[PDB]
Design a protein around this ligand. Sequence first.
Ligand code: 5H9
Ligand code: CA
Ligand code: CA
Ligand code: CA
Ligand code: CA
Ligand code: ZN
Length: 316
Amino acid sequence: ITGTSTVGVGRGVLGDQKNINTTYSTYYYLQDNTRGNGIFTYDAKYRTTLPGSLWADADNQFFASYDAPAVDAHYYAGVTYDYYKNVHNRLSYDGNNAAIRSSVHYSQGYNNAFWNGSQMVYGDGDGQTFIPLSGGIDVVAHELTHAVTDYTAGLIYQNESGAINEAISDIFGTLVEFYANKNPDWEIGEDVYTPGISGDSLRSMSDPAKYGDPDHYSKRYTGTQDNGGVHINSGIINKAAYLISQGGTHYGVSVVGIGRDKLGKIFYRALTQYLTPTSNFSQLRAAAVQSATDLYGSTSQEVASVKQAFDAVGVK
Ligand SMILES: CC(C)C[C@H](NP(=O)(O)CNC(=O)OCc1ccccc1)C(=O)N[C@@H](CC(C)(C)C)C(=O)O
Ligand SMILES: [Ca+2]
Ligand SMILES: [Ca+2]
Ligand SMILES: [Ca+2]
Ligand SMILES: [Ca+2]
Ligand SMILES: [Zn+2]
């Protein structure tokens, strides 16, 4: 909408106070004009018709329980925008500052979040399995990264290309979580998963097997559930990424870590310059090696570490 840029204040899903960029025209809307062509947050009002209504508030204060998922969707979309712009020189998901749209309060008791081809969508959770999913910065960044992938490599959402697609979203979700530097880790969704159980998460990049996901190609799933295991086999690539960054010895194969920033550069380059819609795991290895070669040189530690990490997870 047309209006003037304002700064509201509210509380997120975890009870933390933050400022949010809003727009004033009779109401204060969740429309941040400070980033690209805007970040817009919508109320789906417990229904499934999208996007719903652009979020409108009378007083620019967002401290109601109902406000919390909107506050975080809006704020964490801003953090994710900042990560891509500041770290990778990428302007929004399309590279041309496309407006970023999110809807919260999607459906009832909805234990998931997604990119629907045009916007991000967040359930509130059922209160036991999840609290509202926009409370997780890794979750928000995971979803926006699906848009980045769709505009770049275009990895088809099934089988190995789909598992790469998922891993890319987990990887950048995590790198954005580290960028914000509030309780960062290599787990996915810990801030919104199971409020009654401490210490768990949906997936682990450092040890995917802790939640039954494969950490080696020999353990890959090849059935038809989950689009051919896209959220399962992502563990193999998540583990490789974790090893590239942090190092370790995995099934007897030692990897020299090179740190998160270099992991991000290598995978961002792979995603945007080398991967294609049908890339498989072997092709991802080749793309990562070439990307590291471009950035650091063929004789570099970085190239050597990429090879070690893919060796460790059985991907040649
Ligand atoms: C980071 C977590 C919190 C959320 C994450 N959502 P997503 O974006 O990967 C879901 N994709 C999805 O709907 O594709 C199908 C589609 C394709 C095209 C258009 C529209 C939809 C996830 O990991 N979801 C898991 C479920 C869970 C949460 C582990 C319980 C699962 O869906 O298996
Ligand atoms: Ca208010
Ligand atoms: Ca965390
Ligand atoms: Ca996390
Ligand atoms: Ca929990
Ligand atoms: Zn996903």
